[model samples]
Target chain A: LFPPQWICCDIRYLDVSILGKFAVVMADPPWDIHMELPYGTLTDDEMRRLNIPVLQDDGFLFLWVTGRAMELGRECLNLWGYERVDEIIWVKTNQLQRIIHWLNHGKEHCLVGVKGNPQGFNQGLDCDVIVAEVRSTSHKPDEIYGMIERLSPGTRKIELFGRPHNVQPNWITLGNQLDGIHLLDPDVVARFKQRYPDGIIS
Target chain B: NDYCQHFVDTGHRPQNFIRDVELIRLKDELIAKSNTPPMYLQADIEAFDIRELTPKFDVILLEPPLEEYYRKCWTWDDIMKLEIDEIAAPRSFIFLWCGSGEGLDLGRVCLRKWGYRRCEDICWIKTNKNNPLDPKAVFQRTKEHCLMGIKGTVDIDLIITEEPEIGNIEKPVEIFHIIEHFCLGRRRLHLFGRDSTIRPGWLTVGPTLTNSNYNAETYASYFSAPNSYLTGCTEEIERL
Candidate 1:
């Protein structure tokens, strides 16, 4: 009998000291890949060492990957001692267009891997990675859940590198503050002042 | 090696799963239903208990009664009086139902109270079926009012078309169109509505009145099924 719980923590340094076996690990790792801005990701060695003992022999791993780092993602998987099962494509409908000098692909990839033999169909064996158009930055379309449903079906789920609002039962969010406070940029403040002139304080 | 030896010697494994089992059966039921499109609920403003009703709704349609309409109902003062933090999702969209007499004022005030600075009113034209003729007043018939107050910039393209019988009013379906267009395959919700054809991503609430003229079967053929006109039209709309 498992109790329903929700916690906010960071994933790069996972504290699996309190988690039990038979856990379902769903991670969107902040890979240290180069982005327009200074984004985050785990180092190769860090990814390898983390989640080693956290995953049981029969546990599952859902990793969201970037298109450019497919090879890096695979390398991380190999080092972690997990076998590559499936690579899912997340097609974004409307997303910030990035110009890749080599290939102009708007879709992102999510690689699904496993430790031991788990029940249900292996998404890797069958081509189940959904090709979806992007909607918003850092937002996974609902179709991702649909794919998970078809591949995993009635299994306990968790999301790594999750936002506060996305918190669901039995789901633990790591590596970010959950406090709902957004600071207004100075330029935004100047624009606001220009728009209203009266300078009303909220 | 000593740490590994100690761990093995103690026969202790890491606590990998920390379950917060508030209510086992209830939690399971909620998770199962999480995928379902959310339901919108309507309640009389003054009489409704916001605390009790907040949890069940994804969106709220408030039609405050006439008596309380003046100030006690959906007024900004009233809205500001409530503890917004108590709301499960305070950011939920609020669609207000108002009458013609106080429509403008209500719109302004409700928006202010709900932390919205701008709003748009949708005219609900009353047909002869509901209002007949009022020889005593100006015109005994036609048109109720609905105002929407949004906090941030809303992509007005997601607004849905109003039912003909209810108002025969045509909104800038651009709002509903955009949502249906851009988020073609995502789940959606419509609160305070009679039963209609349930689209792939759409959910509706309110009384399940039989639209004998447009039942689900016929609607499915016309709108939902493959190669249907609505489906084709939606694809076209999305491309735009």
Candidate 2:
């Protein structure tokens, strides 16, 4: 059975800390959308100057950003030492709570960037519009990590600023709100045992 | 707001127009009850030279024909000649709907060319049932920006719209609402007004109302809906 590694720490991976180089990294930083400077939120500048060194030379980074802060999002990715490559629109078509934007309000952009010459999807292009139901605010869909992993399968993967729900058995997770999460999940083990029969996943 | 300035059309039949210009189409969608029956010269802008028309406008809506996606039939410089040299009054404003990658830059360049400074801009996030993605585009081309230019010391704010676009090559009606809400000048002018079915406070200049123009929109989503869009259309237009 595959067992996920849970790095139960604050979302900040430390400014100077260098976690081991990971081939595929995903981050969902808590950006202060309201400018409230919430206790554990990172500013645009801080998010930009992240520990991208932990990313392998030929690795891909997936970032989540609001439509309003798209320019800032691209800037942060560039500052994180990665070239902006492509994007995915998370269309909240099934969203019920109708807030308004003078422009496209219901959707968010999943920015994709790569450090080096990372390989693309084997075949069958990914849909730019990834339609999914929105369950909760700020919590991303579980299918996204798997989607990214599908590109460079069987490679080292990790999640930054991860939440308890994001603790997939296939990758390591580190976050501030990692408390009270059951260290092990049986369904994940059973599923991984069938898919990844070799050993426990990284 | 009262019609304080000219409402000339450099496109089709303006709700108001130039003194000497032939009409391709005469159109009005709004019920703006103005004195003198809003009898301003409404003429096709592309049909007349800028030097020929003397009336100046306070607000100009430059919607150049984009026969190609993001590519305009008329260059920004062509619009600027009338907008800057002849028609646009001092302290006037231009709501230039810039398209394409190079058009955005051209929108910026044309503003400076006309002695106006870029004040602000508005982006329309277009949503629809079947707005298919362009496999060639890096990002799905669902967003379009309109650069608002001011001649002098005018700094006006913009209202955004993500409203599903309607009419062929026509902008959302929310845009007309935006300018009505935020613009400082009363006399508004619209140019290259392609399929401007919803004219409220301002006048539009485009083509003659022909079945060919609106019929082109009858594809995929429009015609396939299996209903009569001509229910509200006039008998003359419906016959065409």
Candidate 3:
């Protein structure tokens, strides 16, 4: 009830007025990168637009970035009226092996940024770049949740590219794939059964 | 005058006469002297007369800070000197606090010392109680250790609660479970406790006093009381 509603809209065109009063924003912008999968790729302009209206003047932002696009991620922070604060590394232990150039890599960067005058508050505490091993390709390990739980405590948290039904209490999930997946509803069940033939209820 | 005359005629000094005769007579005649026992007395241990004094006890909650303290202070050799076996009783149930990495080593020591064979270690995930200093470090220090050891094999169904964010400390509700599991059903004795509870059989050694708002009787009746008894809710719905 705190956030009231989960808006199903692109981060590039979010309404600032709708956010109202105070807000805390976290975004994983689809940055311009040539990846084998289209879901992982984004243009430079799209990346820049993702920051607009996503955060207020007095809000905090945690921007997820890949190692290849670290520079652009930093640039995005500057353009979005946010200053770079810290970084947490997502060390993917289990990932589908894909050869890029001569290196087989599985890692990404999570850069933290804060909007507003940085000088007003005390020097922000530095958190270690957590090397959390990924449990699944799409899902982060519970350790990531642990780290976020500690850092933010009771702050209203939001995940930009979060999957539907994965929205925890006091957390808002936003993404393209995160739509109309209420597992508790009977109507959704009926639709699922209709979509798949010879489906046995287990 | 008769008593004085008897002492004088006995050819013994007043102090000597009192000690030999009068004191002996009085000791034989007296039934009960005081309601409370003496707080301290001297006890001879290995030819050394150690002054055993009762310290002020509020609640003696012990989480043998062996490994964690060792990691911090490196006082393992000093810790080994204490006669834990002779000190701890078989009747007593212990609450052992363990760390993530070096907890087992300390747990083994406690098991050997207390004569408690059966043990269960409950995991307390430190959700919010991470080191405040962030960004510079990756490994967030979250989670605490709890090792429950009993003298004999008993049903050790220790129900722990989720970790609650109180003040700066991010400790789990399971910590309460350790207390509740031990203290709820039966009488308890806290060896090194803080401001928690004081049930019956609580052989309080240190300052036995507290200013806690929660009544000890309320704590005792927590598990036994009906779901609709206190606030009509078993789960702390507001906590989540």
Candidate 4:
């Protein structure tokens, strides 16, 4: 177990230089699911232009996607030099909760991709479906952390476009809405101490 | 607040509403037609002579207990020794739930050795309600892979995303749906199966079985029925 870390900053201005590479990187991007929501969404082009490649040469990427953004998410994965390998489905069974769509959307998808031949990755320890009740708007289930930990254990992991709820032990979470920057890992502390003397990464 | 109130007011139904009704009808029809008892054998897969069975299965499913996850798991060599080819029809499909670690590569090797060409990889993504508080250093283990192999041109989908019950080795039923859609064979074989895997159609075999009700002639007779399965099932059913 390790302390959690995060940076409250605009993801459009993500500082990959300040935050070092990670073995596992996950993101719940604000994609337009063609419905009204409390949060603003990024355009298709903006998602394609993210500096995701700089995260790691060979690492895993878990990109959350709704039904509308499924193909676009795969396109982004391909554009980011990652091969679309697997997908995790989140079946929402909250009482009477449904996203208005052609088929009454009831599930979300998280596309899994790998940049290259990632090492230290285990296999077949978990199942693919997360049939959890729906949380508040855009809140992912807590089970994702354990699944990730089982695949790539104890390595550097990061989360982009993370919220306060997205933060977890042994992970460096980055998002515009997270709490103020917190770095407890000595190496991370040294990196930030030099990268931003005032502990700010604007 | 009745959800169907919209249909009453709009004078129209959801697109799949009629199709859903048809599905229920079909399900009932099949239930009425299928009176045959399930077939199963209890024996160590390593020692069982699969060739003794007179009938061949057009669809073969193997859920091997791998060395990594269980205290007693089959080795690649022991699994490779299964005479899957002997029990397989000329046109058949094999679904192997191989682990993601070394099993990724070793599974392919087993497939090749058993005369099946790897066609698709079905990923099982797992999410938990409570974080298990663990990690291994590369990526967190969240998914498992099932390798699909084909001796002929049987078709299938590539994913079965669902939460699993605690302490259950039961694979998702979605895979069975996928298999049923592609393979029209009533004489199917499920290896390394348990009581939970028992069903009306499949001939399951595993050491974990508590009892044996399988007779080669009786099992084969079930498939001999005039309407055991639709003859020359259309390509739509073939590719469903």
Highest-scoring model, lDDT: 4
lDDT of 2: 0.52
| Backbone clashes, candidate 1 | 38
Candidate 2 residues B46-75, lDDT tens each? 666544333455677777765334222666
* Model 1: per-residue Cα lDDT over A1-202, one tens digit each: 1222343445554345444444456667767666654456667677666774455557566677664345556666667766654444433332222111212343455655667666554232122223234444677655554345445555555666676655554344444644422213344335445643663322
| Model 1 Cα shift for residue B107 (angstroms) | 62
Error of 4 at B114 (Å): 2.1
**Ten residues in sequence with the least summed lDDT for candidate 3 chain A:** A94-103
TM-score of chain A of 4: 0.89
Candidate 3, residues B1-240, lDDT tens digits: the string is 121122224422111211101243332122112011112212222232112212222112343234333322223343334344444433445555544333434454655565654334444432221212333222332334455555533112222233344432323434543353232222233433333433332432223234323333443343242321222112322322
Model 4 per-residue lDDT at A43: 83
In CAPRI terms, where does candidate 3 land?
A: incorrect
Query: DockQ for each candidate?
Result: 0.01, 0.04, 0.02, 0.06
Tell me the tens digit of each residue's lDDT in model 4 across A104-189: 34456687788877876775444445545567877887767877887788888999899898888889998888879887878777
Candidate 4 residue lDDT tens string, B1-240 = 221222224422211121111254454345434434678889887877889865887778899887655415788778888888888887777889876555655677788788887655665544332322122213234556677787875222334233355455667776775566553466678898888888765788999999998888878776664544542232212212
Candidate 1 global lDDT: 0.42
Better of 1 and 2 by DockQ: 2
For all the models shown, what interface RMSD does each have? 25.6, 17.5, 33.6, 14.2
Backbone collisions counted per model: 38, 15, 27, 25
What is the full ranking by TM-score, best candidate first? Answer: 2, 4, 3, 1
